[PDB]
Amino acid sequence: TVRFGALDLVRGEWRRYTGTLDANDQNPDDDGVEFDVAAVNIQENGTKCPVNYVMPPGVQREQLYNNNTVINQNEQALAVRIGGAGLQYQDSRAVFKNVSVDMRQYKKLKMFLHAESLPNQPTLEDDEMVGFIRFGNDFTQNFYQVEIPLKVTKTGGSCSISPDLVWMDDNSIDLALDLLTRMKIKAMSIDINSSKRDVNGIYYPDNDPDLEGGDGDGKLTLGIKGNPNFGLVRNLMVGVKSRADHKDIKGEVWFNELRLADLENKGGMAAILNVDTNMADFATVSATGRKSTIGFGSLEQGANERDREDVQQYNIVTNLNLGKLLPKKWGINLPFNYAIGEEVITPEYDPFNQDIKLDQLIRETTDQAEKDNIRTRAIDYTKRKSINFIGVRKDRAPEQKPHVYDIENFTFSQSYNQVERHDYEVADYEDEQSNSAVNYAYTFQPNFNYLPSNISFNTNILRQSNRQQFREVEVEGIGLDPLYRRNFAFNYQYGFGFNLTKSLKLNYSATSNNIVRNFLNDDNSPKEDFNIWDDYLDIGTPNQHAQQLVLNYDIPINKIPIFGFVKASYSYTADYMWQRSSTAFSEYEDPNGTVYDLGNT
C-alpha cells in the first residue's frame, strides 16, 4: 500500500539556464553535472536531513486573515543543488528570470545565501563555492556580476541548526549600487579586447593591478561586461560557480530574500506663477511659469513614479476680439488666439547608460567635446506655437432679409500649429500644421419645383509638415538624414436637397479629397527646401471622390379614386466612390522594365 499524501507536478518561475556561462567549457550539454533547482519551505522542509530549513535571522512570516483567523504565510527559499560529477574549476550553473526592475531610488541590494554539502558526498569546503547574481539586459553581453565566496554550514551532527549559523552574515550579499556605478565609469575606459578582461569579457576591478581599491567591497567581487542598466533590469540570474582548482565541488545553496534597501528620499521643489488678466472684454492674457526640481511629485507617486527631471516650462495664451475693433453696425466675429510656450527638461540620469547621474557623468569625463555632447543630448526641449482665427463670420443684421449671395452665410476658420523639439532621440524635430476651412450653408424659405430647399458647401485646406532628424548619440558630428512627412490636402464637400413635389424629396451630396504633391521631384524624392505656404491655394490631383443621392417618393396614387387605400413609399439611396490607387500601382514597373498603369478603384 502506497499512500500519496501529496502528488504534484511542480513548475517554477526561475528557469534553468542552459548554455555555457564560461568560455573554457563551450559544451554545456555534457560533463554529467546534475543541476537541480527547487524550493525549501518552513511548511514542508522543517525536518530536512543536512540542515533543517529556518528563516534568515530577522525574517518573519507574513500574517493574514483568512476567516477571523490569523494565518502565518509560508516562507520559501530557492534551492540550487549541484551533484553527480560536480562543477569544474571555472564552470557555473545558474537559474534566471525575466523582470522589469528599476533600482535607481535604492542604495543597497541585499540577499541571503546559504551553502551546505550534499549527503553521502565529499564535503564542500569554505570559499570553494561562490554564489553570484548576474543582472542586466542579458546574461552574456551586458550585465553586472556580484560574486561572494560561500562559507559552508557544518553538518554531521544534529539536523537542527540555529538560523544565525544556517544563514551566516559572511554569506549575505550587501551591495552598494554606487559601487556598480563606479565600476561602470571605470570600465568605460577599459577596452573590449583589453587584457584586463577575462576569457568571458567580464572586467573585474579586483583583478586589475593598475587600480587602487578594486571594486570597493572587501567581501563581494564585482564585474561588468557590456554597459548594463540597473535602472531597467530585464534579466536576473542567480547561480553558483566554483573556485577549487583541482576539485569538482558538489553541494546545495539556498537563496533568500533578494531585496532593495536604503531608499533615497530626498524631496523636490516646485514653483508655479500665473498671471491672468482681462481687458474690457477685448483682451485676455494668461501666462504660466512652472519650475520643478528632481524628486518632486504627487502624494500618491511611488519611488519610480516621481519626477526624475528638472522641468522649466512657460506658456502664454492671448485672446483678442478683433471684431470689436470694427464698428458694431456691421458686426464681425473675428476672434484671434495666440498661444506660445516651451519647456526644457534636464533628466536626473544621463539617457545614455540609463543608470549614471548626469552631473556625475559630466564631472568624470575629462573631455570637453564629450561633456558638450552629453549635456546637449540630455536636454529635452519642446516649443509650441498656435495662431487661431476660428469662427470668422458676419452676424445677421437685426432686420435683414436672408439672401443666397449674402456674406453672412460664410464662416472661416484658420489654424496654425508649430512644434519644435530636440531630445535624446531627435536632434531636430519640426511639426507644422495649417488648416484653412471655409463653410457655406444656406436654407431657402417659402414639371415640378426646381428650387433647392437648402444648399451646403464647405472647403478645407489641411497641410501637415513634419521634419524628423534623429541624432547620433555618440558624437554630434553628422547625425541622421532628415525625414520629411508632408500631408498637403484640399477637401471640399457640398450638398443640396430638392422638394420637387410634396411627395418627392431628392438629397444629393458630393465629397472630394485631393492631395497636393508640389513638394516632390520627378522621382520619388522629397524636396528639403520647401515652405508650407509655398502654393497654399493649389488644388491637387484628385485622391478620393464620393457621391450620395437619396430619393424619397410617397407615390401619390390616391389621386385616382380606385387605389385610394394604397400607401406606397419608395426610397432609393445610391452611392458612388472613386479611390485613387497608390503610385506603386499607377506606375508599377515589371522586372522587364515596362511600366503599367494598374488604375484606380
Binding site: 500500500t1 523582470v99 536576473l236 530574500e257 531585496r259 474690457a280 470689436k324 469662427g391
Partner: protein, 577 residues
Amino acid sequence: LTTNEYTFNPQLGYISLQQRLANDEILAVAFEYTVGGKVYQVGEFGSDGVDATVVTGNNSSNQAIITQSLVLKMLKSNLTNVKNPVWNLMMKNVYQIPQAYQIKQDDFRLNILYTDPSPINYITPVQGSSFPPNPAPDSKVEQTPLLNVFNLDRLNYNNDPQAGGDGFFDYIPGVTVDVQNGRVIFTTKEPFGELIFNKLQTGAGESYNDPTTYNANQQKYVFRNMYRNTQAGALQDSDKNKFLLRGKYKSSGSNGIPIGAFNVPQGSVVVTAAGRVLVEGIDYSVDYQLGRVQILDPSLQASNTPIEVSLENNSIFGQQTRRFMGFNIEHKISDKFVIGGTYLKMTERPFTQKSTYGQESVNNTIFGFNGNYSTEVPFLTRLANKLPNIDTDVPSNLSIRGEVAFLRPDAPKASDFQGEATIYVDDFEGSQSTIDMRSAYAWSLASTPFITSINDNTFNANSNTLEYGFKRAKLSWYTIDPVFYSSKPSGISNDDLSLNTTRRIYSRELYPNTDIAQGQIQVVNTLDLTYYPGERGPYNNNPSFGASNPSANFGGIMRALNSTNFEQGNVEYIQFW
C-alpha cells in the same frame, strides 16, 4: 471552425484564429484558390471529399460500417517539433497591439528602436568591423532608421513610394496592419532573422541557417532563435531581444475624452492643455456620470496638443488603506491678497510586512506656500476705450497667483527590514506553483508499459495477442471515503481504521507548520494505491499466473495532463509526499 472563428488573407495565403493554439491542438485545412483562370486545391472539402460513412448490409447483425477520413493539410501538429517544416508554417512576424481594436491611420504611431541599454532608433556596427560596403538603397543599415531597416517605411502619407520614406510606419490595412484586430504584420516573415542577416551579409560564405558562419555583426543583431525555436526556448538567447516596437494609438470610440472612470467625484477633474490648467466652465465640460471630458475651446480642438486629464476614481479594488491628513492656512492680508500654508501627509498601510516590487507603499509629505492677489485695473479699460471702435464699460482685471511646494517622500515604517526601507525583488514565496495529480477519479487503467526502451519486451508490451496483458497484477487506486471515519459503516471496526494504511491523515501531522482557517478541511485526502502482485489483474488471461514470480508483474494507472507544454510552463519536477 466557423467563419467567425478565423480570418484569412486571400492574397498572402495565411490565416489568423480567434483562439490561439498554445496546447497540443491539431490544425488542419483545406483550401482552394484561383490564379487567373487556374484553380488549385490543396485539401479535401466536405463537398468533394469521401462520404463520412458507408454501410453495407440490411440488418445490424451483418452490417459493415466504413467511416472515412478527409485528407487535409497539417498546419499545426499534435506534438511540437521545431525541426519540421510544419513549425515554419506558424507566423512569427505578427504582433498584437495590446487593447487595440480599431486602430486607424493618423491615430497609430509605430517605431522600431534598439535598447542597449537606451532606446536608439539606429544600429551601429560592432567595434572593429563595419556594415557591408556599397549597399543597395533598400538595404541601407549604417545611420538608417530601423523602420527602413526592417522594411516598414518606404511610402509617404498617401502610400506613395518615397526615396527614404517619410519616417512613419507604413499603414496598409491588407499588408502591414490588421485594422479589425489591431495587429501589425511585418513585410517579411523573419524581420529580425533572415532579413537583418541579409542586410548585414558581407559574402556568400555566411549562411543564415549556419550560425557558426556569422560575421560578428550577424552574431549580435540576428535573433534567429525566435524563429527556429519556441519563445520559451528563445528565452535562452538573452543578448538578442533588444529590438523594441514602441508606439501609441488613439482610442476615441465616441465624442469626448474617456477618462476611464464612472461616477467620479465632482471637482476632482483637472485638465492641463499645454502646462496651463483649464477652466471647468469655459475651456471644457465634464460629464461625471458617463466619465467624459469635452474640450470646449475651439483653439485646443484643432491643436493636436496633448491634453492631460487627472481625476480621482473611487472604484478602487485591492488597494492599500491610505491615510490622508494635514492642514491648510488661508490668511488674508487684505481684501485682495491671500496667503496659504498647506501641509499634507499621505501614508499607505501595506497588507503584509513585505512589499514586493510594484506593490509598494508610500509615506509621502508635501507642504507649500501660496499667494493670490486679484485686483481691478481701470487703466486697461481706459486704454481699451482709446481703441477705434471700442466703447465698453466692463471692468478689466488682473490676478497673480504664486505657489511653491516641497515634497518629502518616504516609506512606511511597517515595511522596513532591519530599519531600512525594503523592496523585495524576489522573496521566493511566489515561485514553485503546483498542479495536483492525486485526484483518484482522474486516473484510469494503464496500458502495458516499456521499462527500458521501445525494443524491451519485459511486460509483454510488444505483444499483439492476449499475452500483452499477461503481466498485469491487481492494483486499486482510491481515496478512503470519509464515511469510514465519520459515520462508521457496519462491519468496520476501530482496528480497521488504525493501520497506517487505512488511518485518516491530518494536516497537523504532514504539515505541522501550516495554518488552516477554522471550519476548513483539516485532513489530507491521500491517494492510496494498493498493489497485489500475486493477484490477477483485469483482462489478464495468463494460463499460469500463480506459478510465476509476483515481482515480474506490474500494476499501473495513467492520466491526461491539462497543460502539455512543460517547457513553456517550466514544469520542473514531480514532487510527492
